[PDB]
Write a protein that binds this DNA or RNA. Structure first.
Lengths: 29, 465, 105, 183, 50, 96, 88, 21
RNA sequence: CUAGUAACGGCGAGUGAAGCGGCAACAGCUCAAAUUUGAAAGCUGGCUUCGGCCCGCGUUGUAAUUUGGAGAGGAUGCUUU
């Protein structure tokens, strides 16, 4: 099922992603 | 106009005369004087139309006028998507700069990282680079680049097609933006190309198109031939092909200049006269050799793909694609016209291995006809023992064998179609057997967040050099 | 002295200053501890004390000075090793928001 | 390149291969004399990096020294006592270096490299004939071997102030009263 | 426990297909010996001088 | 004027000579020392051995002056000498 | 401080003392198969196979003496288990 | 002397020179 | 000279350096880790008519090349004995 003719086909975490006090990526374990 | 009519230095003007170039084409005439004056220019030109000479002439004149030295820095930087285009730019800059005192060099992926860092430390005043290797050298290798006066991007649409959008964004950020002239070229303009032109250029540039919109497309009657051959018998089928399909016109396309120069000198000892065309020869010799082949009635010409896609191919009986092509889309649409064109009956053939059966599915999805060739294994000139003896005995052909083998995997590794031409699938022992080795030479084949450290948090501040 | 105060405390040896600071959390998980009292020293003269809840909680860094330990023979006082103390805090600990975080630690 | 494999093997002294060999050789050395001659080095990688060559004039000697203490602590190592006893046994030779081979709960074992200063092969060859000079008589007695240099604290830095250029020499220079002519 | 376990070949079971050294080979491995010609010319001087 | 601010261009007048240096009312001893330094020197030129001359002669006798062919030859070039190196030895010898 | 124009220096080959040699890493891995395992490494191997990863790092500190040495030693021994089940 | 030492003294010996005042 | 300074001693008796700076004198090198592998090319003896004859050591490694502000190998063109 190659959609476009001669190009490539399109393509366990120990943490949760939340928000920190400065609006960053805070990780909660 | 002419190059003599243009006002240049005595060393550059006499270097163009040694190349034999007198006339000046479309992209050379209306992009070089604005570049010499200082204005930044973007253009849309087909490759092989002379646009390599269009960005090199203002680069050399700037370096010579400012009297650059190896202790000064990098001067001009040229950015190029794949390896084999970078060696052609290095090949033509060697002929263009032969009368000047400035330094030229190339940094490409798949080469020696430590040797490139030593070259950069000594000082190269004209650098031709692949975006992946250039980012690693700018981040890690200590070399002078504060005296950067020009940045040239070559085949921009191919760079974003490979997937170097992130690296080209980081390249512009690192490089000094003040008082430098930027000059990018792309055959097709997309939104990503305009995004790249926006962050690299300074306000309003002059915009050039030379490209032709009316392009001939394929039909359902354009037959493309393919032959399935094992990796250890690819050259032996080619040698058996040429030695009986002589007294005809044969063109074979290769993947690297080292692959061309190895097989050109290999075919002198196993008795098969073949004309050659690669970047290590001079430009006057290259156009003379093509003129002899154009006027010949029969013979064999060996060249690379990216040298051939700029040149005008005459009426020939067979077009042979021994190695995977750099642009498979541009391959079929162009060499399909090149074989089927004119009153002559020409047939186009592409070598396949059993691990590249995915190309036939790609071929059938595009609805272009195929022709398989049987290849009886009896009619094989088994000169493997003679070739293996001669490589292990002659030192120069031994060196040419390693350089061709090394450049073949590297061009295989930089390929856009990861799915069809995968480097971790083909047996390395069989490939070195075709090159004339009992044992494979040592080539490095390589050259989402999960399970973070406990309690770790992203970086907030600090001075990291 | 402070480890003798804490029956729920485990003493730990020299920590590499060339390591990363969040490797203390991997260290305290190993010893199954939700609090870290880190004594960090600089130049062989200065002391810095760190208080932290281990996986995610807050962390405060102090500079410790004017140290007088139990072995100094001018104190005249002694108590049971491991007894539950009465914690005397100040009124400023409940007013300033940063002192409220320090008080809970 | 067999000696790079031997270097990594000697890093893993507690492994199955090395601990088996060091067991059966510790018993073999105890069946022999306290000081005896080895025909070849038992650790050829270590001897070669310390300056051994298969030439006429180089010999290897094996030695045991009783481990432990005198609560007084000896200021020289057990390798130094091993070197001095071999040098007394072979008075005509010069001690070049020595290395650990085996270790028991009673004895430490060493192998000493010796060079003959009167052998013509040694004397005609530069880069070894410095040992023929009379300034190198009994280097192990005066602490000029590798273990001697460690014990005398002859290292650069602010951590070896009292021991660079000699401990007694530096003490003496700091404790003479220097009186000039015009005071 | 097993006091003498068998060795699991985790490293040697995967066969290396290339040499370790990527260093180039010298010319001297491909040409006649330079040391051989020197000893021969030393002998030629001795026969010539008698 | 310097477009690039480099201090070395102020002092200017990747390979250099190695074994010597290229150089450009007063006491008599200094004048005598100046004459001894600039006195012309006998060259003491270096020739080629007899066997080297026959090897170059046999190379020209079979191939003329095509240095690319003598490099590719094996019986008359047992050491794979490069055509650039053989051409240099020919010019020293006298035969092109 | 004083305003002196900076210059970039050549990469020091002594700064390349951090070993990246592919041949030495080949020799270390081949010798590890030949030599075997220490008595204390067998205790760590058994504890990692049983899932007691915390006990393994505590025991290896007590044998080596540093958290950095205990962390590396459990990491080399972890990859031995990974490559042994791949060969088996 | 070693032949590596002899080669260095053959091609780079101690020279005779003077400095003008 | 730094300097009875830092530092350590019931912070007693006291003990007690070093960096910088000014001078005297200045000099740099040798191995192990790489296969010469198209040729152990290395060396101890002792028999000599003194030029070269054998006995051996040594491949579990003797010569040449390399010793990390390096190096190797190819190419390249000058320069040195």
């Amino acid at each position: 099922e190659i959609l476009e003719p001669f190009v490539d086909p399109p393509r366990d975490r120990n943490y949760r992603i939340e928000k920190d006090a400065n609006g960053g990526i805070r990780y909660v374990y | 106009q002419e190059f003599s009519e243009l006002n240049l230095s005595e060393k550059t003007t006499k270097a163009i005369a040694e190349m034999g170039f007198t006339k000046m084409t479309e992209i050379q005439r209306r992009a070089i004087p604005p570049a010499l004056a200082g204005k930044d220019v973007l253009g849309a030109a087909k490759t092989g139309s002379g646009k390599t000479l269009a960005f090199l002439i203002p680069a050399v004149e700037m370096l010579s006028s400012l009297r650059f030295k190896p202790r000064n820095g990098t001067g001009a930087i040229v950015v190029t998507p794949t390896r084999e285009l970078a060696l052609q730019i290095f090949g033509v800059a060697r002929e263009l700069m032969k009368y000047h005192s400035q330094t030229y060099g190339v940094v490409i992926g798949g080469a020696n990282r430590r040797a490139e860092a030593e070259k950069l430390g000594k000082g190269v005043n004209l650098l031709i680079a692949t975006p992946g290797r250039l980012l690693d050298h700018l981040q890690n290798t200590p070399f002078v680049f504060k005296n950067l006066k020009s940045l040239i991007i070559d085949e921009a649409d191919r760079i974003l097609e490979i997937g170097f959008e992130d690296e080209m964004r980081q390249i512009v950020k690192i490089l000094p933006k003040e008082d430098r002239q930027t000059m990018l070229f792309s055959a097709t303009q997309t939104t990503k190309v305009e995004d790249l032109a926006r962050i690299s250029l300074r306000p309003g540039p002059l915009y050039i198109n030379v490209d032709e919109e009316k392009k001939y497309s394929t039909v359902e009657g354009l037959e493309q031939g393919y032959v399935v051959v094992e990796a250890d018998k690819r050259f032996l089928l080619l040698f058996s092909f040429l030695k009986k399909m002589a007294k005809k016109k044969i063109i074979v396309f290769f993947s690297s200049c080292n692959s061309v120069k190895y097989y050109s000198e290999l075919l002198q000892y196993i008795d098969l006269p073949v004309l050659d065309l690669h970047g290590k020869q001079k430009q006057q010799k290259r156009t003379n050799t093509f003129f002899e082949f154009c006027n010949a009635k029969s013979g064999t010409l060996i060249c690379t793909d990216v040298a051939a896609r700029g040149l005008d191919i005459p009426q020939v009986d067979w077009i042979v694609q021994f190695d995977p092509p750099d642009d498979p889309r541009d391959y079929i649409h162009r060499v399909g016209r090149t074989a089927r064109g004119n009153n002559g009956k020409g047939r186009s053939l592409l070598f396949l291995q059993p691990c590249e059966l995915g190309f036939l599915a790609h071929l059938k999805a595009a609805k272009v006809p195929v022709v398989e060739y049987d290849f009886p294994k009896n009619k094989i000139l088994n000169v493997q023992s003679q070739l293996e003896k001669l490589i292990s005995t002659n030192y120069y052909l031994n060196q040419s064998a390693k350089e061709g083998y090394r450049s073949y995997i590297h061009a295989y590794a930089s390929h856009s179609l990861r799915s069809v031409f995968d480097v971790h699938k083909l047996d390395l022992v069989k490939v070195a057997k075709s090159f004339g080795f009992s044992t494979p030479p040592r080539v490095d084949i390589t050259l989402p967040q999960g399970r973070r450290a406990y309690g770790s948090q992203p970086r907030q501040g600090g001075r990291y050099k | 002295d402070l480890a003798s105060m804490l029956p729920h405390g485990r003493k730990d040896a020299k920590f590499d200053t060339k390591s990363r600071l969040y490797e203390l959390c991997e260290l305290a998980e190993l010893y199954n501890c939700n609090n870290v009292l880190f004594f960090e020293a600089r130049k062989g003269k200065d002391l810095y004390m760190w208080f932290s809840k281990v996986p995610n909680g807050p962390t405060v860094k102090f500079y410790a000075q004017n140290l007088h330990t139990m072995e100094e023979l001018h104190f005249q006082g002694n108590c049971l090793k491991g007894s539950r103390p009465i914690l005397s805090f100040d009124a400023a600990f409940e007013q300033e928001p940063y002192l409220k975080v320090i008080k809970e630690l | 390149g067999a000696l790079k494999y031997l270097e990594e093997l000697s890093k893993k002294k507690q492994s199955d291969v090395v601990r088996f060999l060091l067991r059966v050789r510790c018993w073999e050395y105890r069946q022999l004399n306290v000081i005896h001659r080895a025909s070849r080095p038992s650790r050829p990688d270590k001897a070669r990096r310390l300056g051994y060559k298969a030439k006429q004039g180089y010999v290897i000697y094996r030695v045991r020294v009783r481990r432990g203490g005198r609560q007084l602590k000896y200021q020289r190592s057990l390798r130094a006592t091993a070197e001095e006893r071999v040098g007394r046994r072979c008075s005509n030779l010069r001690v070049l270096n020595s290395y650990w081979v085996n270790q028991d709960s009673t004895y430490k074992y060493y192998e000493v490299i010796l060079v003959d200063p009167n052998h013509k092969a040694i004397r005609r060859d530069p880069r070894i004939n410095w040992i023929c000079n009379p300034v190198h008589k009994h280097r192990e007695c005066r602490g000029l071997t590798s273990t001697g240099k460690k014990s005398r604290g002859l290292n650069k830095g602010h951590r070896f102030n009292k021991t660079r250029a000699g401990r007694r020499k530096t003490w003496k220079r700091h404790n003479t009263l220097s009186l000039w002519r015009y005071r | 426990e097993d006091p003498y376990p068998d060795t699991v070949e985790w490293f040697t079971s995967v066969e290396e297909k290339m040499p370790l050294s990527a260093a180039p080979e010298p010319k001297r491995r491909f040409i006649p010996s330079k040391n051989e010609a020197k000893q021969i010319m030393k002998l030629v001087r001795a026969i010539r001088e008698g | 004027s310097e477009s690039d601010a480099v201090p070395q261009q102020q002092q200017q007048e990747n390979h250099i000579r190695q074994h010597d240096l290229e150089l450009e009312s007063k006491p008599e001893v200094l004048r005598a020392l100046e004459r001894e330094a600039t006195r012309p020197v006998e060259k003491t030129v270096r020739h080629q051995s007899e066997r080297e001359r026959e090897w170059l002669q046999r190379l020209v006798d079979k191939h003329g002056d095509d240095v690319a062919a003598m490099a590719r030859d094996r019986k008359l070039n047992p050491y794979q000498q490069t055509a650039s190196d053989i051409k240099r030895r020919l010019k020293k010898a006298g035969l092109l | 401080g004083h305003k002196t124009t900076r210059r970039v220096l050549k990469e020091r080959p002594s700064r390349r003392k951090g070993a990246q040699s592919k041949r030495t890493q080949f020799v270390r891995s081949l010798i590890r198969e030949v030599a075997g395992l220490a008595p204390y490494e067998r205790r760590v191997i058994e504890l990692l196979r049983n899932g007691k990863d915390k006990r393994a790092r505590k025991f290896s500190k007590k044998k080596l003496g540093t958290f950095g040495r205990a962390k590396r030693k459990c990491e080399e021994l972890q990859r031995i288990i990974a490559e042994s089940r791949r060969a088996h | 002397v070693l032949e590596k030492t002899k080669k260095r003294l053959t091609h780079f010996p101690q020279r005779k020179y003077a400095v003008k005042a």
